[PDB]
Fold:
Amino acid sequence: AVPKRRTSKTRKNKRRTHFKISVPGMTECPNCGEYKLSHRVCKNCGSY
Amino acid sequence: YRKLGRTSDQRKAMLRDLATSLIISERIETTEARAKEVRSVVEKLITLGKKGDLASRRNAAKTLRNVEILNEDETTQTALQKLFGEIAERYTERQGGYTRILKQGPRRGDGAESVIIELV
Amino acid sequence: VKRTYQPNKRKHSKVHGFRKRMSTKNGRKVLARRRRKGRKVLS
Amino acid sequence: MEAKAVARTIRIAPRKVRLVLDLIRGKNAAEAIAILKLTNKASSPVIEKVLMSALANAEHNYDMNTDELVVKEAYANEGPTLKRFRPQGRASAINKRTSHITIVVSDGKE
RNA sequence: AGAUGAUGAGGUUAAUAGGUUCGAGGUGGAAGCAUGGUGACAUGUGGAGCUGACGAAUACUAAUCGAUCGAAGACUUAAU
RNA sequence: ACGCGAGCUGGGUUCAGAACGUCGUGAGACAGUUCGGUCCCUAUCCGUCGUGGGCGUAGGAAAUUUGAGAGGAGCUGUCC
RNA sequence: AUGGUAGGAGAGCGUUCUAAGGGCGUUGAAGCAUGAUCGUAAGGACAUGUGGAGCGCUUAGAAGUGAGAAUGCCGGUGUGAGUAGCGAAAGACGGGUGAGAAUCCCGUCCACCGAUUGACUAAGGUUUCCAGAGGAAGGCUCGUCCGCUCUGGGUUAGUCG
RNA sequence: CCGAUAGUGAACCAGUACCGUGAGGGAAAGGUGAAAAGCACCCCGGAAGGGGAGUGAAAUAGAACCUGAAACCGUGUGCU
RNA sequence: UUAAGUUAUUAAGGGCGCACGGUGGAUGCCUUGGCACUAGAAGCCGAUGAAGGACGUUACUAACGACGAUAUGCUUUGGGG
Structure:
């Protein structure tokens, strides 16, 4: 129920190798303004 | 079908509230799933309005809430009256559809997929 | 659930309090102690 | 030529800010701004503020062109923590952590 | 198909989902009108009307414009 | 670990209460009986059951496959 | 001749201070960091960076004279881990304000308590009351809001206690 | 004799914050610079923060202000 | 070209070293404060209201000191400029 040994930096950062953010799509808005979110008419100048 | 994280009665009441507000305003901002569910509800209401008969009027009053609109020229009508007068005439010739969903970005307090749903 | 210290201004000032401490020789000794220690409040 | 900007004592944890910082390191400024606009995380607008401050510093103090710049360094360091005795639980402690964010931007020459 | 992710069906040269129309099955005779009955009620119009997930058909609505990644068949020997 | 309570009960025994019989001057005891009597834990490592990502496999891909090995299965009756 | 625990004997290294002598220091002391240096050991120098005022050496003399362990004391900081949890309850839309809104204001609908989630009076608390202003900290999220902060105000008795 | 975990419990807000019904118990907390000359002005930003400029011998001496160790958290790279 | 054989290149992440940063408050230097003592006075008050406090007092004000409705002080003698 409790850990018997502490976790080392190596083990911690190994476990944290799939813990990250992906990258969005970023289809560049052909209409006008900032770059639109894909399949989204973004509130901040999107035209999807 | 979707449960929307609510109980049966809460879901029913929220759906008919959404549909009434949409009939009132003709475009509303909400979440993706709620929109994908209220779509069918409002479309069936418009079908009843196009049928136009008394029985359909009553079966639509089963669903709609009793709300008063402040129409232009200082006139007043109900959502039922609007549905059976104007929204039925606009779509007398169209066969299905009547609604369109347009995605927007996420909200701040959540990461909820915001959406506009609009009559066409 | 019910807890200790149901406050009461009168009982506080009656069982503690300056006149009650001065009414007895041993209560005059706690005041001398608090004065000697430098306590800002004596009662 | 390098232009730098740092934001000190931000009330966000470094573990959380570094996730989004890792996406923009080595990028061009425009695409980095776009990534930050399209990421829904609490630290995105803060990092955007820092980045735009750096670009403004480059444009005003060093007279560089903002069309040919890249994010060279981007990191978050720990600031001082704030201790709070959580009363809701049973006599536990809660550290509110904070970050010093830094981004530097360069044209890639000398 | 599935905790997520995977898997599979589809992305306008399109029936993937929704809607619409028609069905299947389920329930069991809508409203309105008329008639009879003092009245509760019953009868007819009429296997009526209603119907979530099932099926078919129909582009009315949405699956947009796009962007990224992605190789350049070694060397040695023996046969040929 | 008379396999298995960080998987479950808690009938038993034995902790505070009380009673019978016996013993003890007595406080109390027997273990001889009887009624009653609080079972904690967010899984770090190995392990196990499933399920993904990366890289590899002398070019890169889609599909169909061989099978070194591994697992499963293995019961039985009555009647003519 | 030289393995060695209880243990006995001996010789030494370092720390702070004092006496005397002789010296170093803004042309940069002690401390800190690095180094491929010296010594049989404890340990000692040198060089370079940082720092910005005191410090070594020789002989002797005094000790609060050397820590890795005491479920030691005090402070900092991790691990578990982006994990458990975020404290009983119906919300939806529109409009507004704003740098910024699921969470603030207004409106409509809906719903809940209803011998009570209602209204008074005592005890207790003691300015939490009201207007503006504010988002650093507090609020288990957010916040343009607040019982939070700042400024200024507010309690009227012959018959009430 | 101590020189800020020392030395009075207290070098500063001390027998004070705080705990306890009460008798009583009882902390933590020193250092900009010679001189405040304590950053005019411009830029990003809602502000906080910062980048220049400037004062200064010095601003990685900027009030979370002498020196600034280690644990701990990171970014880059040579070998793997 | 066909066989047989050998042997690479990738770093999602990790290890070692080096450099540069942050956190944090040890170390050194310092002293506003303390510890132990020597010598010399004194040994302490109070109904003429004490020791201790509470309320107040500055133009502006919280705390501490000083003071008391003559209130952040009054008169007077003597120093000082």
Remarks:
- Residues 78 and 105 of chain B are 33 Å apart (CA to CA).
- Chain B has four helices and five strands.
